[PDB]
Scaffold this active site. Sequence first.
Site, short mmCIF file in Angstrom:
data_model
loop_
_atom_site.label_atom_id
_atom_site.label_comp_id
_atom_site.label_asym_id
_atom_site.label_seq_id
_atom_site.Cartn_x
_atom_site.Cartn_y
_atom_site.Cartn_z
N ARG A 155 61.72 81.43 36.57
CA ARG A 155 61.99 81.92 35.20
C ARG A 155 60.96 81.45 34.16
O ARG A 155 60.72 82.11 33.15
CB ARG A 155 63.43 81.54 34.81
N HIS A 322 67.13 65.35 44.87
CA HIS A 322 67.63 64.96 43.54
C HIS A 322 69.15 64.83 43.51
O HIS A 322 69.83 65.29 44.46
CB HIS A 322 67.09 65.90 42.44
N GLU A 369 65.51 66.36 38.07
CA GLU A 369 64.75 67.38 38.83
C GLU A 369 64.93 68.71 38.14
O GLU A 369 64.00 69.54 37.99
CB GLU A 369 65.19 67.43 40.28
N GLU A 378 57.49 61.06 37.60
CA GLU A 378 57.24 59.80 36.92
C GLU A 378 57.12 58.65 37.91
O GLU A 378 56.25 57.78 37.73
CB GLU A 378 58.31 59.46 35.85
N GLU A 381 53.81 58.90 39.56
CA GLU A 381 52.78 58.41 38.63
C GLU A 381 52.69 56.88 38.58
O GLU A 381 51.59 56.28 38.55
CB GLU A 381 52.95 59.01 37.20
N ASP A 398 66.74 68.70 49.03
CA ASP A 398 67.61 69.41 48.05
C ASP A 398 68.63 70.20 48.86
O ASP A 398 68.86 69.88 50.04
CB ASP A 398 66.80 70.31 47.14
N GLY A 463 58.47 73.88 42.58
CA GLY A 463 59.87 74.20 42.34
C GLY A 463 60.78 73.18 43.00
O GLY A 463 61.97 73.43 43.17
N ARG A 481 66.13 73.90 55.42
CA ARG A 481 67.53 74.16 54.98
C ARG A 481 68.07 75.37 55.71
O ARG A 481 67.30 76.15 56.25
CB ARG A 481 67.63 74.37 53.45
N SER A 570 29.03 85.78 49.16
CA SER A 570 29.15 85.56 50.61
C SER A 570 30.26 84.57 50.91
O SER A 570 30.35 83.53 50.26
CB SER A 570 27.86 85.03 51.21
N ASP A 606 45.27 56.46 60.92
CA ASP A 606 44.69 56.60 59.54
C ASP A 606 43.97 57.92 59.41
O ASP A 606 44.09 58.59 58.38
CB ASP A 606 43.79 55.42 59.17
N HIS A 629 45.25 70.15 45.37
CA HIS A 629 45.07 70.48 46.80
C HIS A 629 44.28 71.80 46.80
O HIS A 629 44.62 72.74 46.11
CB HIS A 629 46.44 70.71 47.44
O1 LIG Z 1 61.05 72.94 37.21
C1 LIG Z 1 60.92 73.24 38.44
O2 LIG Z 1 59.78 73.20 39.02
C2 LIG Z 1 62.11 73.69 39.29
C3 LIG Z 1 63.42 73.03 38.83
C4 LIG Z 1 64.61 73.72 39.57
C5 LIG Z 1 64.47 73.55 41.13
P1 LIG Z 1 66.09 73.70 41.99
O3 LIG Z 1 66.93 74.77 41.21
O4 LIG Z 1 66.76 72.37 41.98
O5 LIG Z 1 65.84 74.28 43.33
C6 LIG Z 1 64.68 75.21 39.21
O6 LIG Z 1 64.18 76.07 39.99
O7 LIG Z 1 65.25 75.55 38.13
CA LIG Z 2 54.41 60.89 32.88
CL LIG Z 3 64.69 71.11 50.23
ZN LIG Z 4 67.92 71.42 43.31
ZN LIG Z 5 68.61 73.72 40.56
#
Ligand SMILES: O=C(O)CC[C@H](CP(=O)(O)O)C(=O)O
Ligand SMILES: [Ca+2]
Ligand SMILES: [Cl-]
Ligand SMILES: [Zn+2]
Ligand SMILES: [Zn+2]
Lengths: 690, 690
Positions: A155, A322, A369, A378, A381, A398, A463, A481, A570, A606, A629
């Site tokens: 979204r 999460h 999440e 975070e 990081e 998840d 996501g 899943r 190329s 390694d 990446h």
């Molecule tokens: O902000 C994101 O990258 C994804 C958060 C969340 C992931 P989830 O719904 O927990 O699969 C969503 O899609 O709204």
């Molecule tokens: Ca930060």
């Molecule tokens: Cl997952």
């Molecule tokens: Zn989720």
């Molecule tokens: Zn969600």
Amino acid sequence: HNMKAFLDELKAENIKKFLYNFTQIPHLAGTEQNFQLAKQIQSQWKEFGLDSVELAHYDVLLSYPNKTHPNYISIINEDGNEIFNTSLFEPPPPGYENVSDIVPPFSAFSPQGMPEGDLVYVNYARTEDFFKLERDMKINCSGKIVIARYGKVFRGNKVKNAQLAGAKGVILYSDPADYFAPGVKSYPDGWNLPGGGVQRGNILNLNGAGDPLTPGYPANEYAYRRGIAEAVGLPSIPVHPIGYYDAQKLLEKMGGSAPPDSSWRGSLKVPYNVGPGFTGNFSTQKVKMHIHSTNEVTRIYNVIGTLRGAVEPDRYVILGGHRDSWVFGGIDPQSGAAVVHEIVRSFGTLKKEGWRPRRTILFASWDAEEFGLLGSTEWAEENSRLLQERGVAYINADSSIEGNYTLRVDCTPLMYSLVHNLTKELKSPDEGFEGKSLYESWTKKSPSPEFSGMPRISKLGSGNDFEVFFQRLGIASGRARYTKNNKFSGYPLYHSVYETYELVEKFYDPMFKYHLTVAQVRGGMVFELANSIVLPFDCRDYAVVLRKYADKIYSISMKHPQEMKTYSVSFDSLFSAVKNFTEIASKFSERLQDFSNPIVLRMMNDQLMFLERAFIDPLGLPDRPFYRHVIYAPSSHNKYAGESFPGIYDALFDIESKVDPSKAWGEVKRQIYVAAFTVQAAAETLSEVA
Amino acid sequence: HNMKAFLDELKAENIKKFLYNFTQIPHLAGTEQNFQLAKQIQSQWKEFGLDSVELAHYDVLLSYPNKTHPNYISIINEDGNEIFNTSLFEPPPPGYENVSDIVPPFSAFSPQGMPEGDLVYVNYARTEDFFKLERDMKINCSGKIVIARYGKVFRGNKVKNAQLAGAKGVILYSDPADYFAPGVKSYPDGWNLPGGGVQRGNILNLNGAGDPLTPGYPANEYAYRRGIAEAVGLPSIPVHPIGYYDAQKLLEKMGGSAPPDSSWRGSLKVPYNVGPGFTGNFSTQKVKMHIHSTNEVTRIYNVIGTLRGAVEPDRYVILGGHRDSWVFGGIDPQSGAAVVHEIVRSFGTLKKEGWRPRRTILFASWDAEEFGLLGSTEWAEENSRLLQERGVAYINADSSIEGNYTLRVDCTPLMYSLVHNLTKELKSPDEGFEGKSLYESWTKKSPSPEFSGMPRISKLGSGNDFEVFFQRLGIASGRARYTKNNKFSGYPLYHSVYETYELVEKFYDPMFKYHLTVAQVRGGMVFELANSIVLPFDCRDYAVVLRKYADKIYSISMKHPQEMKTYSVSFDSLFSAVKNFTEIASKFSERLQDFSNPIVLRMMNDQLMFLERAFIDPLGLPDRPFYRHVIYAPSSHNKYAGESFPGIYDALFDIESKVDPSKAWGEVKRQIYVAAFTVQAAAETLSEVA
Ligand SMILES: O=C(O)CC[C@H](CP(=O)(O)O)C(=O)O
Ligand SMILES: [Ca+2]
Ligand SMILES: [Cl-]
Ligand SMILES: [Zn+2]
Ligand SMILES: [Zn+2]
Ligand SMILES: *[C@@H]1O[C@H](CO)[C@@H](O[C@@H]2O[C@H](CO)[C@@H](O[C@@H]3O[C@H](CO)[C@@H](O)[C@H](O[C@H]4O[C@H](CO)[C@@H](O)[C@H](O)[C@@H]4O)[C@@H]3O)[C@H](O)[C@H]2NC(C)=O)[C@H](O)[C@H]1NC(C)=O
Ligand SMILES: *[C@@H]1O[C@H](CO)[C@@H](O[C@@H]2O[C@H](CO)[C@@H](O[C@@H]3O[C@H](CO)[C@@H](O)[C@H](O[C@H]4O[C@H](CO)[C@@H](O)[C@H](O)[C@@H]4O)[C@@H]3O)[C@H](O)[C@H]2NC(C)=O)[C@H](O)[C@H]1NC(C)=O
Ligand SMILES: *[C@@H]1O[C@H](CO)[C@@H](O[C@@H]2O[C@H](CO)[C@@H](O)[C@H](O)[C@H]2NC(C)=O)[C@H](O)[C@H]1NC(C)=O
Ligand SMILES: *[C@@H]1O[C@H](CO)[C@@H](O[C@@H]2O[C@H](CO)[C@@H](O)[C@H](O)[C@H]2NC(C)=O)[C@H](O)[C@H]1NC(C)=O
Ligand SMILES: *[C@@H]1O[C@H](CO)[C@@H](O[C@@H]2O[C@H](CO)[C@@H](O)[C@H](O)[C@H]2NC(C)=O)[C@H](O)[C@H]1NC(C)=O
Ligand SMILES: *[C@@H]1O[C@H](CO)[C@@H](O[C@@H]2O[C@H](CO)[C@@H](O)[C@H](O)[C@H]2NC(C)=O)[C@H](O)[C@H]1NC(C)=O
Ligand SMILES: *[C@@H]1O[C@H](CO)[C@@H](O[C@@H]2O[C@H](CO)[C@@H](O)[C@H](O)[C@H]2NC(C)=O)[C@H](O)[C@H]1NC(C)=O
Ligand SMILES: *[C@@H]1O[C@H](CO)[C@@H](O[C@@H]2O[C@H](CO)[C@@H](O)[C@H](O)[C@H]2NC(C)=O)[C@H](O)[C@H]1NC(C)=O
Ligand SMILES: *[C@@H]1O[C@H](CO)[C@@H](O)[C@H](O)[C@H]1NC(C)=O
Ligand SMILES: *[C@@H]1O[C@H](CO)[C@@H](O)[C@H](O)[C@H]1NC(C)=O
Ligand SMILES: *[C@@H]1O[C@H](CO)[C@@H](O)[C@H](O)[C@H]1NC(C)=O
Ligand SMILES: *[C@@H]1O[C@H](CO)[C@@H](O)[C@H](O)[C@H]1NC(C)=O
Ligand SMILES: *[C@@H]1O[C@H](CO)[C@@H](O)[C@H](O)[C@H]1NC(C)=O
Ligand SMILES: *[C@@H]1O[C@H](CO)[C@@H](O)[C@H](O)[C@H]1NC(C)=O
Ligand SMILES: O=C(O)CC[C@H](CP(=O)(O)O)C(=O)O
Ligand SMILES: [Ca+2]
Ligand SMILES: [Cl-]
Ligand SMILES: [Zn+2]
Ligand SMILES: [Zn+2]
């Protein structure tokens, strides 16, 4: 004390108990209820046997509706009377109706505003829907309120697309075409979305940054924060989601042009006219949004459990998912969290009998999440130096179920062999495959588009909480899943108040046998990664896919043969690099087979651990510094989808429309060089070391 | 086969033979003579015993005068007659006069042009000289030709400073104040610079980028190159260097204001008036530059030799220095290259007797160092993934002598203990210290400003081939040479045609005993790094210096107490982090002492190897993405000098002059947070791993 001991200890009955326990009240990020659940998990993981279990807290930007000033949308007449208002809350499900603190539907991080204007209908608000409207139908969205149906893409990509089209507001709604399966009843009597149901969700475009205010650095006690005007990823126009009863009222009066084709028509009894604005009789009525949500810095809590390795304690295998939900989280995320809790319990039972894994296993219950992967990002990081020099693999956890049809796996090519081998050892839970392996049912129901007698395994984009580990830090990652037979749209009750324990127990998995199967796949992967003497990665599988991705990007470029001639574009360097990688990987695999020597063993492991790391470019992708990446990134048009050779893909995308072709093709050639160089450099990490 | 065997094998007589062999003809980068020497070294290193010796070639932007259109500067009268011209070449030294291919003096990467205008004299063209001129004397350099004396700072910093002051050209010259030591004769009868001598050198501001056309990626066969207009680091105004005979002619006519003080007067018999322009009688004469040099992509060659480790072949200790010279390179770099050649010979003698070091040693002869560290940087760009996961340490080996007074060492704090211990074991070569240790002579002649009975060891900035390894990749680095009793200005014959074999053999080191001493320090360091069971790094020494650097940056900020109150600027987080680092390092050192277990050994050695790596920020320093070390960077005012907490230092520099103090102090606070976070994160890599 082997893998079988571990797997046999897992019980469907325990997953059921935990799921019930985690889904009685809402656990919205930054709320007291979610902190209380964090403390509960920390306690139980200690009782289950882990060596240490700590809360890591951060103060991040979150978003919430104003309790005394509700968000809603109106149709307003020429005198400014609001003649229709959308709903202020979803009708609560049976037996809840008196639960407090159910957050009403809203789009997290929407700015405040009261825009009014004419509506334009933009289908799924994909890049190609906006091209159709603007280029083909010559409809202008500038200064309009756009209405888009949920589905197909993240979204936040819709809102970004609406913003760049010049919209002044966005209304998102759930169409029965995408969220009502034929022949199934609405909740509480089946798993379909009722007309008052609404999907919550954030609309940020963070591109991997984490907390909007602290990109690059953990949001700890002394953090310097950007001002809101410089925050990363925030939308500049108001956004609000509604259900299909309300959508019907906004869409039924639509005038202007007819839908350009049937792929633009959902299942409501309306014309699906694109607009702008209403038909002749109502041409003077407008739509008015009222958004009053606020952004606020709020404390969030991750639980981090450690099971110290007996032989290599400085090598980390991480199982994370999460804990925060929009409301009750009966599927998202608690069907995953319950599985993680049972895996921790099983590893702790072995540990109490004196076993320890070879490498360190870290277990994480991430917070926030739903507000943009904030807790995992975070923490990563904060700990990035440890993770990049010690991180073996990250397995996400998840939702364990989003259907009950078959397995759905997304992972790095380095884990393909591991997944094939484990699933061949596991029993299928499917009807009509009793006594057959999971591999057999999965391959039958989800065949590889490329190969005979192999299952489909998809690419990783974003996501979910694996994003920082894989796309930023280059740690081998995977997820698995159960799914339905709409891949990116979500199950019907996604992010609604109706996603409850009863939904799962009555309609998805009454025997908890699909949950158990997912616990065996996730836990099985962690066990092998953490215990196998040689890391269970196969570099030759990366060589196979690299050739496929090189063929595919070449094919996209070859739609423009005159420009490739003019600008001497190329792909030879990239195919040469893929050839070299194939050759070096073949020889490395021979040595890994041919090689009592533990330093030799630590050297080869390694090389295997740092192979994913070698695909990281420290300069990142163009204008997306946290996606580093070079082989994979989240699609620029849909965060949920992975894209291969993303730097070349984005350079070529819509290139026929660029005003300076010389410059555009120059950038394609630059990205081919970066891709060829990085493939060759990754290959060289598998050469003999000296 | 121990360190003593290695050190005793080194011979002064061999260093002398190699130096003579390397200094008979010019070895300018990109020339055939320099390629021939590369092939010779490759051959000899193979004969000496190395396992493999390869040439790694790249095609990089170089700069050369136009042979048929010489660069020079004139004084031009009101009719456009050139009434004085500077010299087109340096008078060649005795016995050379017929050597071909001596490049005439020029500033590498100067753009072409023929600017004419009034002169302004800007002393050393330092940031503070320009503040004096513009702020105090209210002299405007805009549209003027600036004349600056060499010395004190890197010449590229002078040109950057002149460019931002609005100059239209820069003339650099060698003043006898800085390049003629009292009581010593000019070359060929002593080591002083004659009046026709001129210092060559590049004037780029690359900030660590390497080849101007390929920042981030090696300049290989398929590289995508920037266009010249987007190249990194090129000056926008013409630049040319001259000797002091010619300088006297340009300076003698200068009018306008008097020098603001005596620190602005050199040793020429002129007033050192600042200008602009000439005194009344000559007020209509102007200065005119004629610069016709061209930039061209040219092939360069590094020689890379490998001696494979017996126990840890995937851990690399690197000894590198450059091979290219401006002319004969009798000191710079061949006094270093000869030392490296003798070290390779000694290691190869042990190897032929069956010995191998514990870890892999790589030996490098870098090309195009004089044109901006191009060869080392491109190679490190190509091999960055190997180096960052396998690189133990880098020891540089440019000029072994720049005087004959005492040792000069610059290194990471992690190598302080190693240097103290090795030098206590080595014999001093100094007059009056016979039978005393090198440590004793060095400490006596160069005492630490902080500590009693300890020698001075300086910080690393840039200006040599260790830069990419230390400032970009965070590999522990060190350098050691003999020096004079002007630290950043160079010895008098620096980069002149007079820097020959005879200069060294007659005036610097006739017995080659200082060369031998430097070979024992460099080779001794490599031997210990490559052979010691525990890496010879002491993390507690980093803790000591971090506190010193924190005190110093706090003291700079505290010159602005009212602003620190207004904007709530606290250094508490940074001191807290330094305290934590001190505590964790103390406990890690106890474990390193208290810990037969080779995986435990590989774990602790990895913690020691990755500690320098932990000071790297992947986002780099502000507007300098290739300087990523948070504790050290090359000074923004002088590339040759190291600066500590550079991100905070640059935020505070001249802050009283910023128009938006709120914003300026906001950025100081941001840099304090980044510094405190990185110190704490580095500390955490030394905690127990799980
Ligand atoms: O902000 C994101 O990258 C994804 C958060 C969340 C992931 P989830 O719904 O927990 O699969 C969503 O899609 O709204
Ligand atoms: Ca930060
Ligand atoms: Cl997952
Ligand atoms: Zn989720
Ligand atoms: Zn969600
Ligand atoms: C895949 O692996 C192979 C090695 O197995 C690797 O091959 C290398 O390719 C490069 C680029 O083609 C070769 O570079 C050549 O090196 C020679 C010296 O050895 C030079 O003389 C060549 O330059 C001349 O020719 C060029 C092309 O006509 C001219 O542009 C140039 O001006 C010179 O006249 C050229 O630099 C290199 O020798 C091989 N190495 C081998 C065979 O061992 C290939 O690069 C790898 N793929 C990738 C994408 O890295
Ligand atoms: C140096 O090492 C020490 C650990 O030995 C480390 O100490 C940590 O400091 C942080 C920041 O001060 C502490 O964070 C606190 O954590 C508690 C929960 O444990 C919170 O309740 C605190 O928040 C409250 O108080 C704040 C300040 O008044 C308020 O702003 C806030 O709104 C809350 O009311 C606070 O977050 C942390 O507990 C310790 N950890 C310990 C002691 O183990 C220190 O951070 C290290 N230095 C650096 C620079 O990293
Ligand atoms: C979820 O299960 C947990 C743990 O069993 C329950 O929390 C415990 O409740 C008991 C009895 O009220 C207390 O004595 C303990 O202190 C709690 N243990 C903890 C927090 O570790 C919790 O009651 C259950 N939640 C729901 C909604 O059923
Ligand atoms: C939609 O809601 C709005 C806001 O609550 C309603 O308009 C308000 O109605 C009350 C009571 O008549 C007035 O006192 C407020 O001044 C109105 N506020 C406005 C127009 O912003 C409106 O009645 C509702 N419409 C429907 C169809 O129920
Ligand atoms: C998946 O299982 C296959 C089949 O057992 C493994 O491949 C075998 O590995 C053994 C042990 O090295 C070899 O001797 C065999 O030749 C392999 N058979 C093949 C390649 O057909 C494979 O290693 C497993 N993959 C993992 C563990 O990642
Ligand atoms: C520097 O020493 C090298 C190596 O001893 C000399 O090059 C050799 O010259 C001999 C005799 O001319 C040849 O037969 C060999 O092929 C060369 N060996 C190589 C290149 O490895 C070189 O002549 C000396 N240079 C100077 C200027 O004295
Ligand atoms: C400085 O050099 C310039 C360029 O060589 C000299 O000016 C040239 O002199 C020749 C011969 O008289 C003329 O044919 C050219 O046309 C002149 N070119 C110019 C002015 O650019 C000049 O004579 C030299 N000055 C001194 C003092 O030697
Ligand atoms: C430099 O030498 C000193 C003195 O030998 C070394 O410090 C000693 O190391 C031994 C071996 O671990 C300890 O038992 C002693 O207690 C240490 N003495 C001290 C600290 O005074 C030191 O390790 C050496 N530094 C190196 C090799 O980097
Ligand atoms: C919520 O409701 C109203 C809007 O002005 C008022 O009570 C309060 O300011 C709001 N709270 C906020 C802005 O968080
Ligand atoms: C779209 O409409 C707005 C309305 O003023 C206008 O500014 C913009 O130029 C229009 N764009 C196109 C391509 O019609
Ligand atoms: C679960 O499986 C059965 C068997 O096809 C099916 O009837 C039911 O609808 C499935 N549940 C969901 C939610 O897809
Ligand atoms: C060098 O001298 C002149 C200047 O025009 C001419 O022979 C040639 O163009 C020049 N060569 C270059 C530009 O490299
Ligand atoms: C310096 O002189 C130039 C000459 O035109 C002018 O543009 C500039 O404003 C002057 N700056 C100051 C501060 O005098
Ligand atoms: C070398 O040492 C002697 C002793 O002081 C001195 O006379 C000579 O000038 C020194 N050489 C240089 C180049 O400093
Ligand atoms: O470009 C640089 O960073 C330094 C090149 C060179 C270093 P060297 O003279 O070889 O010490 C110089 O200072 O001119
Ligand atoms: Ca480069
Ligand atoms: Cl050096
Ligand atoms: Zn040098
Ligand atoms: Zn030099």
